[PDB]
Amino acid sequence: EPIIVPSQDVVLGLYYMSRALENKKGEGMVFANTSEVKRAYDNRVVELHAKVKVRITQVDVDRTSGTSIVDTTVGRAL
Amino acid sequence: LRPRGPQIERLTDNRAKVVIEPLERGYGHTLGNALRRVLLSSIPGFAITEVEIDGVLHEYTTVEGLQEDVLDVLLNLKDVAIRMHSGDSATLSLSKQGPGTVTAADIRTDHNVEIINGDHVICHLTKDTALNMRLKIERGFGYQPAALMLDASFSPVRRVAYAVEAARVEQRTDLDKLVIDIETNGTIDAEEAVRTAADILSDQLSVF
Amino acid sequence: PRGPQIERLTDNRAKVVIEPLERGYGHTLGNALRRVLLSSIPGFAITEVEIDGVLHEYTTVEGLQEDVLDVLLNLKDVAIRMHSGDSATLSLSKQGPGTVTAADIRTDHNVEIINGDHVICHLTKDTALNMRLKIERGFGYQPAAARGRLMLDASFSPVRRVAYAVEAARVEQRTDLDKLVIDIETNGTIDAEEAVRTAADILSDQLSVFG
Amino acid sequence: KGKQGRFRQNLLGKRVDYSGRSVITVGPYLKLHQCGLPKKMALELFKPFVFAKLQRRGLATTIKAAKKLVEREEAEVWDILEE
Amino acid sequence: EIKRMLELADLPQSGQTQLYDGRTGEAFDRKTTVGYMHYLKLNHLVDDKM
């Protein structure tokens, strides 16, 4: 195991950002990429804990690129 | 203390990096925030708010007849940028020619509206009898949600991130250095966007 | 656009009203003016104190109840408003029993002193107190190290606390225009109008680098 | 023999120069490969390299004038210590 | 008794009020505990150890 582990103050922020709630403002919408999620969060129109289905592009190593739609949280998209 | 600059580094074709001289202690963060929110949600622009695709159009995902789904078509049409003249509204029509690959430079252009990017695909066509789409442009100032209806980002920038580093002159040690990252879509320059943001903030401070 | 509206709740603490701003302009302007009203405005303070009987700041002088450090902190507590000039020198002469206030000093026509309900020191015996002061101009906080003679710290800040809040104004416009109020609490040295005037001057001089 | 003998206090563990100690705080702006260091502490530790660079730059003919220029603490010794 | 002494003045009951950030001017998500604590200074200075 690596000896560098994130300590309590950063895993507290990661646990606050990664959690999801039931009823929050700005849920149920579809976003294009990560930059649209950042632009929506920075304008204070969507909460940090909201079940928002976003679309992200990631490559796969064996390098082939692919796109898919996942139902995640706004904080997990950020 | 008056800073000497601003030095701008264009590391990409659309992403820039503004490096400002070391300011006084405390001015850098408030100047970065007052430039960031003004660049984010004060600069007006043009975007696409709604689309009218031919066919059934009963739901947002209940459609067929193409290689990709219509939701990916709507998300690819949402992410494109468009500028225009001082007119408020504009109606555009997009139509394909056959089973090929359509780009952003296929809309029947008007003399009043212009297209920024030409190499930007939205979908792939594999069958004949391609349907035509109708698009509408509304002028806005910031970000607007949906509340055939789509979201629209009227801001010309995509992501603005600023950071305060540590830089000191030989005389004094406690000075703040501001580095702003601007990612414009390409309808305007990044230095021009920073200049119009500073002019807007200067007019808003000179009115009061 | 209409101009700042001034409310008068207290003679020492005023309140300005700015309306109507557009959507998304209240918070940035409020935070910028709050930070500049907190840590940019220059003022006047006492830098050095020259007393004939007091050699260093740790001795004891006959006839005084408190020590020399209490007199130095009480001289640091008071505020002095000067009209013109970058330097001044004020002297005080008080003998006999009784309290020593800030109004007992000898001031000039341009040097204006607050009435000074806070006392400086307490005299008991019939000892004369000849004390010479010096006022200088500056901004921020300057320590005594980095600048029979004494040295005193100076806090060139006439503003104590700045708060603000954004409220909505029902006006027939294209959207929901919001207003903001700013209550500035000072020490009586600076007024709430020229403070935000020099704050806007500082903002216009700082935003002049672009273009 | 023993812990306080000539074998454990002077052979395995020795007192070394070019070294010092201080308290530690937390720095969030630093990177993983870099750390902070005080100015006077780094001036005391990197004193021979500062003397060699002052002899190479020509600001002092002898090491006595270079030592007096170090203890005078002007801006050129800060430029040398930063370089 | 602590809740009564808090409720006697114009102070909240739970002792947690919402404070704003001074850097960006925005509001935090939760309310934090604000109060006066008797804080002292030790004798272990930084000049003695450096």
Side-chain angles (χ1 to χ4, degrees), chain A residues 1-21 23-24 26-43 45-46 48-52 54-62 64-70 72-78, chain B residues 3 5-11 13-20 22-23 26-53 55 65 69-73 75-78 80-83 85-87 89-92 94-95 98-126 129-130 134-167 169 173 175-182 184-190 193-194 196-208, chain C residues 1 3-10 12-21 24-59 61-65 67-85 87-103 105 107-124 126-135 137-169 171 177-196 198-211, chain D residues 1-39 41-83, chain E residues 2-6 8-25 27-50:
Chain A
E1 321 295 300
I3 207 65
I4 53 164
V5 65
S7 279
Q8 62 271 15
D9 286 333
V10 283
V11 304
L12 195 79
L14 285 170
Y15 187 77
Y16 183 77
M17 196 177 52
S18 86
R19 275 199 84 259
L21 261 69
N23 180 81
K24 269 290 185 179
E27 66 182 20
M29 57 203 310
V30 194
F31 284 137
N33 54 4
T34 307
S35 309
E36 190 155 332
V37 182
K38 185 73 180 305
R39 194 160 61 249
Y41 175 71
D42 288 5
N43 291 33
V45 311
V46 58
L48 194 56
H49 322 89
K51 306 176 180 180
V52 169
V54 303
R55 158 191 161 188
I56 45 178
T57 80
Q58 49 175 350
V59 310
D60 213 318
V61 292
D62 305 332
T64 55
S65 183
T67 185
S68 45
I69 300 175
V70 285
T72 56
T73 323
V74 188
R76 300 176 187 174
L78 287 177
Chain B
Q7 301 152 317
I8 179 165
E9 164 185 82
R10 305 188 60 88
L11 76 160
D13 57 345
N14 283 328
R15 182 176 302 179
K17 202 167 191 178
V18 177
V19 181
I20 319 189
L23 303 102
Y27 279 81
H29 192 275
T30 175
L31 273 188
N33 187 269
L35 281 178
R36 170 185 181 266
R37 204 165 304 268
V38 161
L39 278 155
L40 201 55
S41 45
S42 88
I43 306 179
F46 299 94
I48 310 167
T49 50
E50 48 189 354
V51 78
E52 185 184 5
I53 186 66
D69 211 338
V70 292
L71 196 141
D72 271 28
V73 175
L75 267 66
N76 224 334
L77 280 175
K78 181 169 56 180
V80 80
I82 183 166
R83 75 175 295 269
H85 198 265
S86 66
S89 159
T91 303
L92 295 181
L94 170 62
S95 162
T101 298
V102 300
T103 78
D106 294 76
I107 302 169
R108 299 181 179 182
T109 47
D110 191 278
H111 291 356
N112 191 268
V113 68
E114 297 93 359
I115 315 294
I116 297 311
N117 45 1
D119 177 68
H120 190 263
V121 306
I122 47 171
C123 53
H124 291 171
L125 269 302
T126 43
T129 76
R134 265 79 60 89
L135 285 88
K136 291 189 177 181
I137 308 168
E138 280 138 21
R139 181 180 178 270
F141 286 88
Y143 194 82
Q144 174 182 142
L148 77 160
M149 201 86 208
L150 312 174
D151 304 330
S153 60
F154 308 110
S155 57
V157 304
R158 298 307 183 184
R159 36 202 310 174
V160 175
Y162 77 108
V164 174
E165 301 176 350
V169 287
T173 58
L175 280 78
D176 283 338
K177 164 187 173 181
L178 177 59
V179 173
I180 315 178
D181 303 287
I182 303 301
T184 319
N185 65 86
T187 180
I188 42 176
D189 213 8
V194 172
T196 61
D199 212 7
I200 280 176
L201 199 57
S202 186
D203 298 358
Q204 283 288 332
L205 278 146
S206 159
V207 158
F208 156 72
Chain C
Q5 301 299 129
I6 301 103
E7 303 186 18
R8 205 65 51 89
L9 279 75
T10 310
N12 199 24
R13 177 180 68 93
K15 179 182 299 181
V16 287
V17 176
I18 311 171
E19 55 175 358
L21 294 189
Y25 280 160
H27 295 274
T28 43
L29 266 298
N31 187 32
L33 293 201
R34 180 195 172 273
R35 291 171 64 95
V36 168
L37 276 156
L38 271 186
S39 54
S40 280
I41 293 184
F44 308 99
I46 303 178
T47 75
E48 61 165 5
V49 175
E50 290 190 357
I51 322 177
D52 54 355
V54 190
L55 197 51
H56 54 89
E57 53 186 6
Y58 300 100
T59 189
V61 54
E62 212 283 310
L64 206 67
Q65 173 172 333
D67 216 359
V68 186
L69 297 179
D70 293 28
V71 183
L72 291 180
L73 267 295
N74 291 332
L75 284 172
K76 200 197 301 180
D77 186 31
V78 306
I80 294 176
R81 166 177 53 185
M82 189 158 56
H83 283 178
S84 161
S87 168
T89 294
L90 301 187
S91 183
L92 59 98
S93 278
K94 176 66 178 181
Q95 68 175 10
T99 62
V100 178
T101 67
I105 72 179
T107 175
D108 203 8
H109 56 272
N110 44 8
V111 181
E112 289 187 347
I113 316 293
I114 315 300
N115 314 67
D117 55 354
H118 172 58
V119 292
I120 299 299
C121 55
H122 200 89
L123 279 171
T124 58
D126 201 329
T127 72
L129 186 63
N130 300 123
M131 180 185 306
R132 294 157 50 185
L133 310 181
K134 181 185 177 181
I135 320 163
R137 206 178 191 271
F139 70 103
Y141 173 72
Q142 300 186 11
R147 285 295 184 89
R149 180 200 66 176
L150 281 84
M151 201 64 61
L152 186 60
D153 288 319
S155 66
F156 304 101
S157 279
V159 194
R160 301 303 178 91
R161 51 158 57 94
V162 181
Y164 80 107
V166 180
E167 203 82 353
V171 57
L177 301 183
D178 51 0
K179 71 179 185 63
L180 77 161
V181 290
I182 293 177
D183 37 21
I184 308 172
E185 180 174 355
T186 58
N187 44 9
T189 310
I190 201 166
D191 200 18
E193 311 310 302
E194 69 205 310
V196 297
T198 194
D201 194 304
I202 279 174
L203 260 297
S204 288
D205 292 8
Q206 281 284 151
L207 288 181
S208 87
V209 55
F210 305 99
Chain D
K1 69 185 297 180
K3 307 172 186 175
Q4 324 277 357
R6 282 290 175 269
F7 197 83
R8 303 255 307 276
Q9 291 288 142
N10 297 123
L11 288 180
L12 267 302
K14 305 180 180 182
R15 302 265 183 176
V16 295
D17 45 356
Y18 305 94
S19 85
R21 75 191 296 112
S22 186
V23 304
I24 48 171
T25 76
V26 58
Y29 69 101
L30 299 172
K31 294 184 178 180
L32 188 55
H33 62 90
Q34 66 180 8
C35 84
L37 211 62
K39 277 196 300 179
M41 196 175 187
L43 188 138
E44 193 70 33
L45 288 183
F46 290 92
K47 210 168 191 178
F49 301 97
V50 159
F51 283 157
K53 201 65 66 178
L54 281 182
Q55 285 301 307
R56 205 154 316 274
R57 281 300 187 272
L59 294 182
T61 43
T62 46
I63 213 166
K64 194 174 182 179
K67 184 187 302 297
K68 266 55 151 184
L69 210 71
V70 168
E71 307 317 316
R72 201 198 318 267
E73 297 275 3
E74 48 174 54
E76 269 296 276
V77 71
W78 293 125
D79 200 352
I80 291 310
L81 189 61
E82 193 176 90
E83 204 154 80
Chain E
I2 299 178
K3 280 190 175 183
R4 185 58 182 91
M5 298 314 277
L6 280 167
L8 204 146
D10 314 329
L11 269 65
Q13 310 290 141
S14 45
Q16 302 182 347
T17 175
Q18 182 169 351
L19 50 85
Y20 312 98
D21 194 14
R23 276 190 168 183
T24 181
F28 288 151
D29 301 337
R30 312 185 192 185
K31 309 176 180 180
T32 83
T33 61
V34 196
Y36 279 77
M37 187 182 178
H38 189 66
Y39 206 85
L40 52 95
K41 176 188 175 182
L42 297 189
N43 207 17
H44 304 152
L45 306 166
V46 75
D47 205 0
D48 187 30
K49 303 183 178 303
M50 176 195 65

